[PDB]
Design a protein around this ligand. Structure first.
Ligand SMILES: Cc1cc2nc3c(=O)[nH]c(=O)nc-3n(C[C@H](O)[C@H](O)[C@H](O)COP(=O)(O)OP(=O)(O)OC[C@H]3O[C@@H](n4cnc5c(N)ncnc54)[C@H](O)[C@@H]3O)c2cc1C
Ligand SMILES: NC(=O)c1ccc[n+]([C@@H]2O[C@H](COP(=O)([O-])OP(=O)(O)OC[C@H]3O[C@@H](n4cnc5c(N)ncnc54)[C@H](OP(=O)(O)O)[C@@H]3O)[C@@H](O)[C@H]2O)c1
Ligand SMILES: Cc1cc2nc3c(=O)[nH]c(=O)nc-3n(C[C@H](O)[C@H](O)[C@H](O)COP(=O)(O)O)c2cc1C
Ligand SMILES: Cc1cc2nc3c(=O)[nH]c(=O)nc-3n(C[C@H](O)[C@H](O)[C@H](O)COP(=O)(O)O)c2cc1C
Length: 645
């Protein structure tokens, strides 16, 4: 039941496809592979999330295995795949001499340890005597080539397995892993979009004496929390960034400054409409999915309505995979479209030209090819097994648990920019962030008609479960933590929203410092310096707060702002400011300071790291390489932590 070799064998599976995915990217591609493997060779494949099984009996797997692994933190596996990571990192020599596998690693060359998880995993597997079929795939999210990278690796591996297994191909045809059934009435056991099944009327939320909602809150059961306060942090007529405050008192959730919050979204109504239209799906359709074997896991709560699935369960928005096109050939509206489609699925570049570059969503791509002709022969099952599952988006909590124990602050910059290719098309927006903004405007009685809100969301939720200004949520414990000793110096680097953690960090230090003031015994606070950065004065996050914080922390605090887009001057980054203050920074580091790097970036991570290596290199008068080794050490020990996304 958790005994991998046993599960495979008992269910007579010909192939095993494992995946270690944090955000689900690895999982979805794993599914794409599995589906195609069934479509072309009718193999009875097993899709498993590496986290749900015990790989002790891995060397007893009579079938070939495909491993899809992502890289996080250092060159390490996704949280909750460490068990797997350890079985591997501990498997002795010859411990997996029967294992035959191929692996596709998902990473991003913008980080040091690019695809290191897959690499580590490939090094230990071969160490235990496992034979590796085909080339080690490496999807580079940094170059935005992940989908094509997969297509490339995919095609070559399938050839290999065709040989290795002596399989006879066949025209690719879809085969549901479920038993689709169309119901007629809606029960209390049927979902209208509720997150986990526990929120279905016919189910009882597990609380305590005082009604406080209990149970563990994670990806398999969020906690619907209300956003009690919300405001705009920017003052730019093009960009927005929202400050959201979540009340967690109605639950036994505890968070530590430095943790992450996962916000479960829903789709923009105007996109839900586009999807439902191009296919010609009736929202009111009630359906149920019945697995065709124990290995198969229903995607979301069922039965449910088509419109609920498309609004709360499927990622109908985002870049269309070329593989989707290939899989859509079976249900082309007409011979015409079927041909155009066929071509695009095969031509890497034409696909990018006709679809990708225009920022299409499935709805758009298809409507583009059909010229409006609906794709009314596409099965909801296919759509369910073929469209990526919606997934929570994470945020660096910007509140202090010591001064907010029950409340959680989130600093999300809204994603919404003009289509670079189509000057008349709608903006390219992000679900969650625009959703958070919608709630923000709403909650504040802002006339959203005037605003630049590009889309809008169902703010009531399923059965009004989202009781105005509420959303499924769950805390994700991290390692980003302030030093134990208050005296230890601290260095915080966070461009843009990357300052979120640091706001909490400072709020923690400021809160703490208060307590000491009502207890006499004062502890001297080590030096705390912050390097922040933003375009101009309109995107200067929590501008008003820092001066107050500074007053309460006195000389223990120091902020260094940099602006990359002020008119008439030269673009300045935090790494630039790091070199300006190299003496201060070097000194602090020689005093055991801790280095914190947070934010999005695409570059900033290595940039800042490189800056420090320079500072160190000059400071201790050693080579760049030595200094690089010293920096790697500070990261291994934990004196240099990074929360870069
Ligand atoms: C550990 C961690 C911490 C984080 N902390 C923060 C934080 O503090 N603050 C913060 O703001 N974010 C943070 N993030 C990022 C955040 O989780 C999301 O990535 C961000 O909010 C985008 O959410 P969304 O719902 O708008 O994205 P999505 O809807 O998934 O959209 C992503 C992007 O793709 C674009 N897009 C949409 N459709 C298409 C298409 N068809 N083709 C191409 N592009 C398309 C969107 O416009 C958008 O820019 C963090 C992430 C992690 C993993
Ligand atoms: N990426 C996504 O884009 C959105 C914006 O996030 P954000 O506010 O952090 O981004 P942002 O506002 O672009 O970044 C904040 C600041 O960092 C600068 N910057 C860009 N590259 C940098 C680098 N390599 N090193 C140091 N600083 C750099 C930016 O200047 P520039 O004007 O040079 O970008 C800006 O001043 C998020 O939703 C995120 O998910
Ligand atoms: C917090 C965070 C840390 C990451 N660290 C690395 C890293 O060290 N190396 C790398 O190659 N990619 C890194 N990535 C990129 C992911 O591996 C990549 O986006 C992958 O597609 C994620 O797949 P998943 O969604 O299946 O987990 C990181 C991503 C995030 C969000
Ligand atoms: C053309 C194209 C198609 C893609 N198709 C998919 C897809 O079907 N499934 C998936 O998980 N990622 C797909 N990706 C990858 C995402 O764009 C990318 O990994 C992004 O970081 C995901 O962010 P998320 O965390 O919001 O999923 C595709 C990328 C491109 C460029």
């Amino acid at each position: 039941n958790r005994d991998i070799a046993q599960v495979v064998t008992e269910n007579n599976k010909n192939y095993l496809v494992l995946y270690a995915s944090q955000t689900g990217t690895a999982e979805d591609y794993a599914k794409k592979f599995s589906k195609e493997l069934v479509a072309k060779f009718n193999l009875n494949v097993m899709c498993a999330d590496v986290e749900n099984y015990d790989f002790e009996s891995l060397n007893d797997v009579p079938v070939i295995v495909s491993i899809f692994i992502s890289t996080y933190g250092e060159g390490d596996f996704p949280d909750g795949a460490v068990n797997f990571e350890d079985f591997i990192c501990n498997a002795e020599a010859g411990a997996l001499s029967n294992l035959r596998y191929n692996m596709f690693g998902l990473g991003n060359s913008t980080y040091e340890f690019f695809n290191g998880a897959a690499k580590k995993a490939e090094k230990h597997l071969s160490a235990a005597g496992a034979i590796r079929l085909g080339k080690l795939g490496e999807a580079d999210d940094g170059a935005g080539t992940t989908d094509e990278d997969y297509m490339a690796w995919k095609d070559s591996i399938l050839e290999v397995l065709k040989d290795e297994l002596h399989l006879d191909e066949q025209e690719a045809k879809f085969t549901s892993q479920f038993q689709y059934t169309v119901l007629n009435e809606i029960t209390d056991s049927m979902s209208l979009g509720e997150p986990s099944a526990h929120y279905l009327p016919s189910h009882q939320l597990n609380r305590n004496a005082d009604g406080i909602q209990l149970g563990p809150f994670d990806l398999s059961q969020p906690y619907i929390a209300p956003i009690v306060k919300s405001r705009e942090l920017f003052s730019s007529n093009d960009r927005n960034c929202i400050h959201s405050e979540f009340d967690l008192s109605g639950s036994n959730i505890k968070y530590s400054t430095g943790d992450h919050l996962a916000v479960w979204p829903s789709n923009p109504l105007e996109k839900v409409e586009q999807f439902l239209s191009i296919f010609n799906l009736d929202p009111e359709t009630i359906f149920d999915l019945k697995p065709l074997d124990p290995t198969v896991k229903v995607p979301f709560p069922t039965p449910t309505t088509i419109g609920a699935a498309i609004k709360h369960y499927l990622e109908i928005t985002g870049p269309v995979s070329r593989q989707l096109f290939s899989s859509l050939i079976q249900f082309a509206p007409n011979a015409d479209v079927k041909e155009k489609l066929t071509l695009l699925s095969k031509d890497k570049d034409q696909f990018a030209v006709e679809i990708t570059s225009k920022y299409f969503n499935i709805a758009d791509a298809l409507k583009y090819l059909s010229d409006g002709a609906k794709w009314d022969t596409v099965p909801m099952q296919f759509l369910v097994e073929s469209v990526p599952q919606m997934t929570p988006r994470y945020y660096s909590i910007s509140s202090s648990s010591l001064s907010e124990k029950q409340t959680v602050h989130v600093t999300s910059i809204v994603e919404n920019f003009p289509n670079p290719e189509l000057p008349d098309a709608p903006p390219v927006v992000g679900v969650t962030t625009n959703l958070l903004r919608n709630i923000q405007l709403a909650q504040n009685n802002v006339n959203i008609a005037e605003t630049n809100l590009p889309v809008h969301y169902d703010l009531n939720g399923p059965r009004k479960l989202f009781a105005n200004y509420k959303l499924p949520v769950h805390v994700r414990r991290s390692n980003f933590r302030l030093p134990s000793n208050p005296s230890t110096p601290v260095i915080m680097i966070g461009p843009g929203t990357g300052v979120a953690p640091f706001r909490g960090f400072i709020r923690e230090r400021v809160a703490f410092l208060e307590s000491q003031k009502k207890g006499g015994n004062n502890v001297s606070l080590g030096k705390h310096i912050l390097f922040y950065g933003s375009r101009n004065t309109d995107d200067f996050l929590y501008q008003d707060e820092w001066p107050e914080y500074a007053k309460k922390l006195d000389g223990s605090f120091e902020m260094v702002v940099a602006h990359s887009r002020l008119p008439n001057t030269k673009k300045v980054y935090v790494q630039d400011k790091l070199k300006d203050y190299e003496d201060q920074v070097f000194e602090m580091i020689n005093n055991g300071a801790f280095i914190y790097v947070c934010g999005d970036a695409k570059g900033m991570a290595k940039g800042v790291s490189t800056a420090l290596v320079g500072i160190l290199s000059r400071g201790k008068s050693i080579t760049t390489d030595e200094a690089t080794e010293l920096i790697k050490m500070l990261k291994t020990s934990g004196r240099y932590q990074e929360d870069v996304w």
